[PDB]
Structure formats: structure tokens, C-alpha cells
């Protein structure tokens, strides 16, 4: 059928709509307040102890950077995906730990200090070595350089907007823990309102529910990737002789990954017309890993009460 770009096209204003900028600022505010409320339940003594003994952090880095990209590459080779799909899944595999993993570990209620230390060190190591690993794994895909397209401003801004609320929470708990109730209650109400706003606004901002036109095996691999990440983290931590409380957080940190940098690199490399449903692929991958995490939460809460 020759080779032609997809009929998928996007509105011209989509680049600089006021709605997109509003969505971006609301998401940044949401992440800031999530991280504030989630650092309000931490302490610096335990994070210092965890960084002193990097066993959990080391296993997290190994599970996210040595084995996850390799299995993403093997999945791309075995499933016989195209060039764009293979590059997309590879970039998703090589991405650092997402900030959603902190909330999910809080749901699993395990070792928040260790989770935050591994996620910040994983973002730092992403900035350090995503280019070289993406380069060695992209032989036969994207003959172009690809080293200068990964975001570096985005990574440092994400690190800063994650560290600032955590630092504020640490300092506030250590110095004067007397406005926990009011601040956390206001945070919860504003986060619920913000989530409602994001859910309503994205419905009209995204549109074009033609995402099912994505080929089924790409959905299959975007389904298997979060689950294989979760299983890999859990098995690697368990068979490495670590306690139960400190292993669920490692597993669910390795399973959860950032995906906005995949969107940035794909949109810099290719036009929205060459990219078909892979433009909305990262959004599908994120919500699917969210659903898988919720299923794991249900399993954990069915095992806890019994």
C-alpha cells in the first residue's frame, strides 16, 4: 500500500491554545501540591539512612535502566512493530521513574523516604545516561543522531518541582508540625478540585477518540510493559533478600515511569501527521499503568484483610 502518512491531523491552534497552557499550568500546580502533601509524611533521618545504604536505590536503578530497556527492545523485535512504534516503546522503557509512583507507593503505604530517594536519583541518572543507552539501543531505528532531542530542561524543571515541595514538607515537619490538619485538608480539597478541572478540560482539549485505530498488538505491548515492570521489580527485590515493606515500593517504582518526555521526543522527531495514534499512545500507556496499579492495590487490600 506504498508509504503515506496517516490522515490524522491536528488543529493549527493546538500549538499555542490558551486551553493547552491552562492545562499545563494546572498540571504543574497539581503536581506541586501532590508533592507537598506527600512530603508532609516524610523525614530526613530515614532518607539519609536509605542513601547511606543504597541497596534499594541500586536495585531500583538496575531494574529501571539495565533490564527494562533491554526487554523493551526485545518486545519491539519479537512483536514486529514498525520503526515509530519500536522507538516509542523503547523511549518509554528508558524513561525515568514517574511522580505518580510516589502516590501509588503511598497507596501501598511503604517506605516513602526510600521511594522519593530512588525517584529523584533515577531522574538524575536519566539525565545522566538516557542519551547513550537510547543511542546503543536505537541501531536500525532513527539513523539520525537522537541524542540532542531528549529534553534536558524538562528533566531539571521536573526535578526542581519535585524537590521543592518535598523540601518544604521536610522542613515544616522538622521545625513546626502544628498546621498539618489545615494544610493537608486544604491540599486535599484543592487537589480534588484540580483533578476534576483536568478531567473536564482534557475531554475537550484532546478530542478525536480514534485511538482504537491503533493496531491491537501495540495495545498488547503497552499493556505488558507496566505489568512486566511491576513483576520485574517485585521479583528482583524479593529474591535479593529485602524486607516486605521496602520491596513493594521498589517494585511499583520500577513499574511506573514518566511518559511526557516520550511525547516531547516523538513530537520533536516527527510531525503529528507522520505519527498516527502514537501521538496519543503515551496517554494510553499512562492510564493503563494507572489501572494496573489500581488492580494491584485491590489485590494488596484483599491480602491485607485476610
Amino acid at each position, epitope marked *: 500500500n506504498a*508509504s503515506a*502518512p496517516f490522515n490524522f491531523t491536528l488543529p493549527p491552534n493546538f500549538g499555542k491554545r490558551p486551553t493547552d497552557l491552562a492545562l499545563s499550568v494546572i498540571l504543574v500546580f497539581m503536581l506541586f501540591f501532590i508533592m507537598l502533601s506527600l512530603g508532609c509524611t516524610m523525614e530526613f533521618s530515614k532518607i539519609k539512612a536509605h542513601l547511606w545504604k543504597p541497596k534499594g536505590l541500586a536495585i531500583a536503578l538496575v531494574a529501571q535502566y539495565g533490564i527494562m530497556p533491554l526487554t523493551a527492545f526485545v518486545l519491539g*523485535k519479537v512483536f514486529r*512493530l514498525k520503526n515509530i512504534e519500536a522507538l516509542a516503546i523503547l523511549v518509554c522503557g528508558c524513561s525515568p521513574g514517574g511522580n505518580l509512583s510516589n502516590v501509588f507507593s503511598l497507596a501501598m503505604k511503604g517506605d516513602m523516604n526510600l521511594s522519593i530517594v530512588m525517584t529523584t536519583c533515577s531522574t538524575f541518572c536519566a539525565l545522566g545516561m538516557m542519551p547513550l543507552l537510547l543511542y546503543i539501543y536505537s541501531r*536500525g531505528i532513527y539513523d*539520525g543522531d537522537l541524542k540532542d532531542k531528549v529534553p534536558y530542561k524538562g528533566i531539571v524543571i521536573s526535578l526542581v518541582l519535585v524537590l521543592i515541595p518535598c523540601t518544604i514538607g521536610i522542613v515544616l515537619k522538622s521545625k513546626r508540625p502544628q498546621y498539618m490538619r489545615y494544610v493537608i485538608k486544604g491540599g486535599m480539597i484543592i487537589i480534588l478540585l484540580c483533578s476534576v478541572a483536568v478531567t473536564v478540560l482534557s475531554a475537550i482539549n484532546v478530542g478525536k477518540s480514534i485511538m482504537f485505530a491503533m493496531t491491537p498488538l501495540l495495545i498488547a505491548t503497552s499493556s505488558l510493559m507496566p505489568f512486566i515492570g511491576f513483576l520485574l521489580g517485585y521479583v528482583l527485590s524479593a529474591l535479593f533478600c529485602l524486607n516486605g515493606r521496602c520491596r513493594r515500593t521498589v517494585s511499583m517504582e520500577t513499574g511506573c515511569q514518566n511518559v511526557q518526555l516520550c511525547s516531547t521526543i516523538l513530537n520533536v*522527531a516527527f510531525p503529528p501527521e507522520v505519527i498516527g495514534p502514537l501521538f496519543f499512545f503515551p496517554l494510553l500507556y499512562m492510564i493503563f499503568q494507572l489501572g494496573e496499579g489500581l488492580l494491584l492495590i485491590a489485590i494488596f487490600w484483599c491480602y491485607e484483610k485476610f
Partner: antibody, heavy 121, light 113 residues
Framework: EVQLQQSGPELVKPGASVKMSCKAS????????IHWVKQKPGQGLEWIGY????????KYNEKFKGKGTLTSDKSSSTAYMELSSLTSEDSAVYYC??????????????WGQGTTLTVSS | DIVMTQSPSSLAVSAGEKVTMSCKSS????????????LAWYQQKPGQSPKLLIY???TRESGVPDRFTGSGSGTDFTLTISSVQAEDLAVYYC????????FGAGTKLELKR
């Protein structure tokens, strides 16, 4: 349908500084890449390089790395080529070819009529 | 790199003779992930720009006669014309694009006397 319009014949001194343009108006200009092929008289085709008009990223042949310099203009929907270093041996026929490019350029489905360039005194 | 070598480079076909052109490439230009086998055959009648005939070494471009069929895999490829008609006099190149774009030497056609 689509048709790629070349610039026209060029006659320059051995002092170089010549530029060639390839205008293409049949499609969405940023979806495909534009190649450049050099053909000496009776010596077969020879690849020079291509330009991706979306991100302005270029790839060149090892031999033509020093000389060729490919630029693209989204507004005017044309792709350029500058040599800037010419000798008597350089005169040939230059074509611009359009290929679809997902991760690897696929094939040259459409070609231009060609620019016959002559270098002499 | 890959250097593409066309075997005949000159032959004469009169009315219905086969052509069985062949260019053997250098290494395996067959993508394992996508079973596509990157290759393309262009026909350049004298005084004209080259025209695409075969893409992916097996599929013919819409607009060519049914006479031009391309068959091959791995490194050995073949192009056959079957009933060579009068206007089939050109040069065929069998470019490859697996790693880096390279064209073949070219095969010329004449008529027997």
C-alpha cells in the same frame, strides 16, 4: 498530482558559490524528506544527502560532507543546496527526490527534472 | 558500508527474451523486525529522470506494466521483464536504503542485430 520543480541550468566559474532549489507543491511539505542525487554523464547515479524539512536535520555522504549544505524553507516550500567548492570535475546532473521517512528513508517515489550544472572558465 | 554490484551491466534483448538482472549487495539488507527487505529498482530512459519500478524488492509501483516483476530476498535479487517491448530501453540501478543510500552501477539494454 505532485510534481517537483527544479531551478534550471547553471553555468558558473570555478570560483564556486552556486545554489540550487527544488520546489515541490503537491502534498504536505513537512511529511516527506527531500534527497539530492548527482549523476555525471554516463557514470550512474550517486547519493549526496537529504534534508528533513520538519526539524531541518540533514544527513550527508562521506565524500560530499565537506561541500554539500542543504537548507529548507517551510514558508516557500522549497529545498536548497549549496556547494561553495567547485572544480572542473564537479559538473554533472543534480536531481531532487522525495521519499517517505519514518525512521529510515524508504524509496524515491518522485523525482525532479534535474539541474544541469557546468563548471568551466 | 554496503557496496551494490550489478552483474550484467550490458545486454541485448529483442522481443520477448528474459533479462534476469541481478545485484548481490554486500551484507544482509533484510530487516528482521519488519519483513520488508529494503530495496528499490529505478528505470531511467535516456534524457529523463529516473522512475520507480519496484519497492521493497517485490512490490511494483502503481503505473508500471505487469511485465516488470521483482523477486529476491536476503542479498540476491532479480528483476525480470519477460516480453521486452520497444520502450523498455533504459538503465536500472537497484538502489538500497537499509543502512545508507547507495546506488548500483546500472544495467543498459540494446537490441540484437
Amino acid at each position: 498530482e505532485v510534481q517537483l520543480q527544479q531551478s534550471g541550468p547553471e553555468l558558473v566559474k570555478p570560483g564556486a558559490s552556486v545554489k540550487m532549489s527544488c520546489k515541490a507543491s503537491g502534498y504536505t511539505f513537512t511529511s516527506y524528506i527531500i534527497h539530492w542525487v548527482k549523476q555525471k554523464p554516463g557514470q550512474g547515479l550517486e547519493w549526496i544527502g537529504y534534508i528533513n524539512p520538519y526539524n531541518d536535520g540533514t544527513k550527508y555522504n562521506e565524500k560530499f560532507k565537506g561541500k554539500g549544505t542543504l537548507t529548507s524553507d517551510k514558508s516557500s516550500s522549497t529545498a536548497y543546496m549549496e556547494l561553495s567548492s567547485l572544480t572542473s570535475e564537479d559538473s554533472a546532473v543534480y536531481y531532487c527526490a522525495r521519499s517517505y521517512y519514518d525512521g529510515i528513508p524508504h524509496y524515491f517515489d518522485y523525482w525532479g527534472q534535474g539541474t544541469t550544472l557546468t563548471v568551466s572558465s | 558500508d554496503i557496496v551494490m554490484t550489478q552483474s550484467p551491466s550490458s545486454l541485448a534483448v529483442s522481443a520477448g527474451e528474459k533479462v534476469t538482472m541481478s545485484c548481490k549487495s554486500s551484507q544482509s539488507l533484510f530487516n528482521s523486525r519488519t519483513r520488508r527487505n529494503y530495496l528499490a529498482w529505478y528505470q531511467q530512459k535516456p534524457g529523463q529522470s529516473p522512475k520507480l519500478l519496484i519497492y521493497w524488492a517485490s512490490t511494483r509501483e502503481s503505473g508500471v506494466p505487469d511485465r516488470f516483476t521483482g523477486s529476491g530476498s536476503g542479498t540476491d535479487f532479480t528483476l525480470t521483464i519477460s516480453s521486452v517491448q520497444a520502450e523498455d530501453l533504459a538503465v536500472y540501478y537497484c538502489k538500497q536504503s537499509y543502512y545508507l543510500l547507495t546506488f548500483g552501477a546500472g544495467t543498459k539494454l540494446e537490441l540484437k542485430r
